[PDB]
From Swiss-Prot, chain B:
Official protein name in the record: Calcium-activated potassium channel subunit alpha-1
Note: The protein was initially thought to contain two functionally distinct parts: The core channel (from the N-terminus to the S9 segment) that mediates the channel activity, and the cytoplasmic tail (from the S9 segment to the C-terminus) that mediates the calcium sensing. The situation is however more complex, since the core channel also contains binding sites for Ca(2+) and Mg(2+).
Illness the protein is tied to: Paroxysmal non-kinesigenic dyskinesia 3 with or without generalized epilepsy: An autosomal dominant neurologic disorder characterized by absence seizures, generalized tonic-clonic seizures, paroxysmal nonkinesigenic dyskinesia and involuntary dystonic or choreiform movements. Onset is usually in childhood. Patients may have seizures only, dyskinesia only, or both. Epilepsy, idiopathic generalized 16: An autosomal dominant form of idiopathic generalized epilepsy, a disorder characterized by recurring generalized seizures in the absence of detectable brain lesions and/or metabolic abnormalities. Generalized seizures arise diffusely and simultaneously from both hemispheres of the brain. Seizure types include juvenile myoclonic seizures, absence seizures, and generalized tonic-clonic seizures. EIG16 is characterized by onset of seizures soon after birth or in the first years of life.
Gene name of the encoded protein: KCNMA1
Organism: Homo sapiens
Expression across tissues: Widely expressed. Except in myocytes, it is almost ubiquitously expressed.
Residues of the full protein shown: 828 to 1062 of 1236
Modification comment: Phosphorylated. Phosphorylation by kinases such as PKA and/or PKG. In smooth muscles, phosphorylation affects its activity. Palmitoylation by ZDHHC22 and ZDHHC23 within the intracellular linker between the S0 and S1 transmembrane domains regulates localization to the plasma membrane. Depalmitoylated by LYPLA1 and LYPLAL1, leading to retard exit from the trans-Golgi network.
Residue sites binding Ca(2+) per the record: Q148, D151, D154, D156
From Swiss-Prot, chain C:
Gene from which this protein is expressed: KCNMA1
Superkingdom of origin: Eukaryota
Native source organism of the sequence: Homo sapiens (Human)
Protein name: Calcium-activated potassium channel subunit alpha-1
Family stated for the protein in its record: Belongs to the potassium channel family. Calcium-activated (TC 1.A.1.3) subfamily. KCa1.1/KCNMA1 sub-subfamily.
Compartment list: Cell membrane
PTM comment, free text: Phosphorylated. Phosphorylation by kinases such as PKA and/or PKG. In smooth muscles, phosphorylation affects its activity. Palmitoylation by ZDHHC22 and ZDHHC23 within the intracellular linker between the S0 and S1 transmembrane domains regulates localization to the plasma membrane. Depalmitoylated by LYPLA1 and LYPLAL1, leading to retard exit from the trans-Golgi network.
Record's comment describing the protein's domains: The S0 segment is essential for the modulation by the accessory beta subunits KCNMB1, KCNMB2, KCNMB3 and KCNMB4. The S4 segment, which is characterized by a series of positively charged amino acids at every third position, is part of the voltage-sensor.
Portion of the full sequence shown: 1063 to 1179 of 1236
Quaternary structure, from the entry: Homotetramer; which constitutes the calcium-activated potassium channel. Interacts with RAB11B. Interacts with beta subunits KCNMB1, KCNMB2, KCNMB3 and KCNMB4. Interacts with gamma subunits LRRC26, LRRC38, LRRC52 and LRRC55. Beta and gamma subunits are accessory, and modulate its activity.
Length: 280, 198, 117
C-alpha cells in the first residue's frame, strides 16, 4: 500500500506535462482492501494483474514484450539485504530472459550485488538499464554534504514532485517550501540561443523566461565554461517549477615523474595499498 | 595458487571447477568427479589439468581426500570474480563445471540455483581478444524449472520437461532428477547398474 | 555530480578488476580534471560582499555569472535570520532557486558550481 501510494504520487504528479502512460502492476499476492481502493481511485490509469514475474506466462500476460519499461521496486527495510538482492537479481534475470530488449529500472541495496547484476549478457546500461543503488547514492549524497553542508537536502528535493504551498505566517517554512517547489527537468532549447555562450544563455533564461540551467548535452557537461558554444539541437538540464514552464526554452525567438598520483582514468587520487596497522 | 602464478602458468584443454562452498555447507564429494578424469586408460600426457575456484574454508574442509591425485590446483577466490576466471584461462578449457553446496540448507526454491545461473551468465558475458558464449560449460541445478534462465535464444515454458529443454538437450545443464529412472532400470536388468558404473 | 565522475571506462575497470588501479600522468589525465566542483562561499568577505543587507538575489546571480563564470542554485539561510530579534541559534536551511527579486541579508552562504584552475 505505501510503496504503490508513494510511486503513484510521484508518477502521476500534475507538475509533469500531459503524459498518458498506463501503469500495470504484476504481483503474486492478492491485494488487500486498501490497495483495491487505491487502484479504484486511479481506475483509468492503473491496472493490476496477479502473477509471478518469474513466470513467462505472466510476463506475456502483462504484455511485457511491448511495455516501454519495467520497474522493479525493492524492499529497503528487509531483514536480509543479501536475500533481497538475490531475489531482485532473479527477477531481472527472468525479465531479461523473456525479453532481452526491455528497459529495466531497479533498486539495488548493495554495490557488490550491483556489480554481480551488471554481468548479465542482456544488461545494457547504454540502452537505458539503470540500477539505482541505494547505498551508493546515499553515501555519495553524504559525501557531497561534506563538500557543502545541506547539499543532500538540495539534491533530494529536486526529484520529488512538489506543488507550491504558501501560508500567511512569516516563518522559515514558507521560504523553505517556496524553494522545495522546484524540480530538475530536461528539454531541447531554441535555435534563438544557438551560437551564444552558456553563461550568456543562463543570464538570459534566468528571470526573462524564469528558468535556470545547470548543464547541457563531451556529452554530459556539468556547468560549462564561458568558452563553450551551444550546439544546434541540444537539451538543457533546467531547474524549474515544472515542465510546462521549461517549454519557453524552446518556444522563444526574440520575444523581448613516475609517481602514480591518480587512477587509470585521471579522475580520482590514488596511492599504493597501505597495511591496516599503518593507518590504525 | 594465487593471481600471479595462475596467470603466468599457461593452461589449455584443462577442466575448471567452480565451487560455491561455505563453512556450513555440505560436502559435495569431489573425489567422484576427479577419479574418472584420473583413470588409467588415458596416457599421462593426455591427462586434462584440474583447477578448483572457491572458498578456501570449503577447500580445506575437503582437500583431505584429494591429495593423492596429480595435475590438481586450488585458487582461493570467488567463482563470480572476472579477474579469477580470466587468470584461470577459462576461454581455453575443455570444460567448465559449476557446482553449489548451499542447496539443502536454504529452503526458497528460488535462490537455490541463483549463484550457478549468475556464474554461467557472467562466463557467457565475457569478451576475449571471441565472446564467452562459445566456452564449453556444464552446470548442476537443483530445480528443473530454473533451467529456463540458462539460455536466452531458446523458448522457455514451465510445462516443458527438462529432457526437452534446449540447455539439457545440448548437454549444458544436468539435474539429479533425471536419475529417477535408474530404480526401474536397475530392477529389471541387474547388470545395467554395473555397466553404467564401470 | 555525486560520485565525482564515473565514466564508462571506470565502470568497465571496476567490473573487470574490482579495485581502482593507479595510472601514470598523461595529457588526457590532466584534461580530465577540468570539470566543475560544488562549493559554498561566504557573503561577509571577498568580491561578492557588496551584496550586504537589502541586496537582490538577481543582482548576485548576475554578477557571479558575468564575472566569475559561477552560478548559484540556492541560499543556505539562517533559520532565525527572518526574525527581528537576535538569536544564538546557528542552524540554517536550504532555499532552492529563489526569485531575482529575493532579498539578501549579510549573514548568508550560497550553493554554487565553481570552475577548476
Ligand atoms: Ca514543482
Ligand atoms: Ca531461456
Ligand atoms: Mg485501463
Amino acid at each position: 500500500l505505501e510503496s504503490v501510494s508513494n510511486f503513484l504520487k510521484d508518477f502521476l504528479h500534475k507538475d509533469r506535462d500531459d503524459v498518458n502512460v498506463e501503469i500495470v502492476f504484476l504481483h503474486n499476492i492478492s491485494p488487500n482492501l486498501e490497495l483495491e481502493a487505491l487502484f479504484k481511485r486511479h481506475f483509468t490509469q492503473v491496472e493490476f494483474y496477479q502473477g509471478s514475474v518469474l513466470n513467462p506466462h505472466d510476463l506475456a500476460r502483462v504484455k511485457i514484450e511491448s511495455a516501454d519499461a519495467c520497474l522493479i521496486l525493492a524492499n529497503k527495510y528487509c531483514a536480509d539485504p543479501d536475500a533481497e538482492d538475490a531475489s531482485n537479481i532473479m527477477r531481472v534475470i527472468s525479465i531479461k530472459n523473456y525479453h532481452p530488449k526491455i528497459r529495466i529500472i531497479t533498486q539495488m541495496l548493495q554495490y557488490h550485488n550491483k556489480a554481480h547484476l551488471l554481468n548479465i549478457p542482456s544488461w545494457n546500461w547504454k540502452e537505458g538499464d539503470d540500477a539505482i543503488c541505494l547505498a551508493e547514492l546515499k553515501l555519495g549524497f553524504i559525501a557531497q554534504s561534506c563538500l557543502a553542508q545541506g547539499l543532500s537536502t538540495m539534491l533530494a528535493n529536486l526529484f520529488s514532485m512538489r506543488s507550491f504551498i504558501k501560508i500567511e505566517e512569516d516563518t522559515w517554512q514558507k521560504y523553505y517550501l517556496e524553494g522545495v517547489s522546484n524540480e530538475m527537468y530536461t528539454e531541447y532549447l531554441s535555435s534563438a540561443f544557438v551560437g551564444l555562450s552558456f553563461p550568456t544563455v543562463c543570464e538570459l533564461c534566468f528571470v526573462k523566461l524564469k528558468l535556470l540551467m545547470i548543464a547541457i548535452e563531451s556529452r554530459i557537461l556539468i556547468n560549462p565554461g564561458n568558452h563553450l558554444k551551444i550546439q544546434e539541437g541540444t537539451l538543457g538540464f533546467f531547474i524549474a517549477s515544472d515542465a510546462k514552464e521549461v517549454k519557453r526554452a524552446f518556444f522563444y525567438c526574440k520575444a523581448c615523474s613516475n609517481v602514480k598520483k591518480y587512477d587509470s582514468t585521471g579522475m580520482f587520487h590514488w596511492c599504493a595499498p597501505k597495511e591496516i596497522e599503518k593507518v590504525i | 595458487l594465487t593471481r600471479s602464478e595462475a596467470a603466468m602458468t599457461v593452461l589449455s584443454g584443462h577442466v575448471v571447477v567452480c565451487i560455491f562452498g561455505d563453512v556450513s555447507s555440505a560436502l559435495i564429494g569431489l573425489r567422484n568427479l576427479v577419479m574418472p578424469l584420473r583413470a588409467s586408460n588415458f596416457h599421462y600426457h593426455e591427462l586434462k589439468h584440474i583447477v578448483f575456484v572457491g572458498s578456501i574454508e570449503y577447500l580445506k574442509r575437503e582437500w583431505e581426500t584429494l591429495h593423492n591425485f596429480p595435475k590438481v590446483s586450488i585458487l582461493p577466490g570467488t567463482p563470480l570474480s572476472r579477474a579469477d576466471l580470466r587468470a584461470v584461462n577459462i576461454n581455453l578449457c575443455d570444460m567448465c563445471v559449476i557446482l553449489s553446496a548451499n542447496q539443502n540448507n536454504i529452503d526458497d526454491t528460488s535462490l537455490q540455483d541463483k549463484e550457478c545461473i549468475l556464474a554461467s551468465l557472467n562466463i557467457k558475458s565475457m569478451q576475449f581478444d571471441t565472446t564467452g558464449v562459445n566456452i564449453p560449460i556444464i552446470t548442476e541445478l537443483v530445480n528443473d524449472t530454473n533451467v529456463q534462465f540458462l539460455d536466452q535464444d531458446d523458448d522457455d515454458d514451465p510445462d516443458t520437461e527438462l529432457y526437452l529443454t534446449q540447455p539439457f538437450a545440448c548437454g549444458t545443464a544436468f539435474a539429479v532428477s533425471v536419475l529417477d529412472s535408474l530404480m526401474s532400470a536397475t530392477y529389471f536388468n541387474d547388470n545395467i547398474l554395473t555397466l553404467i558404473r564401470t | 555530480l555525486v560520485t565525482g565522475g564515473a565514466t564508462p571506462e571506470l565502470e568497465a575497470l571496476i567490473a573487470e578488476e574490482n579495485a581502482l588501479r593507479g595510472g601514470y600522468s598523461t595529457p588526457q589525465t590532466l584534461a580530465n580534471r577540468d570539470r566543475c566542483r560544488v562549493a559554498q562561499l561566504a557573503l561577509l568577505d571577498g568580491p561578492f560582499a557588496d551584496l550586504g543587507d537589502g541586496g537582490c538575489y538577481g543582482d548576485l546571480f548576475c554578477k557571479a555569472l558575468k564575472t566569475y563564470n559561477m552560478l548559484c542554485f540556492g541560499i543556505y539561510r539562517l533559520r532565525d535570520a527572518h526574525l527581528s530579534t537576535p538569536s544564538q541559534c546557528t542552524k540554517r536551511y536550504v532555499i532552492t532557486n529563489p526569485p531575482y527579486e529575493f532579498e539578501l541579508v549579510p549573514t548568508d552562504l550560497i550553493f554554487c558550481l565553481m570552475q577548476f584552475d
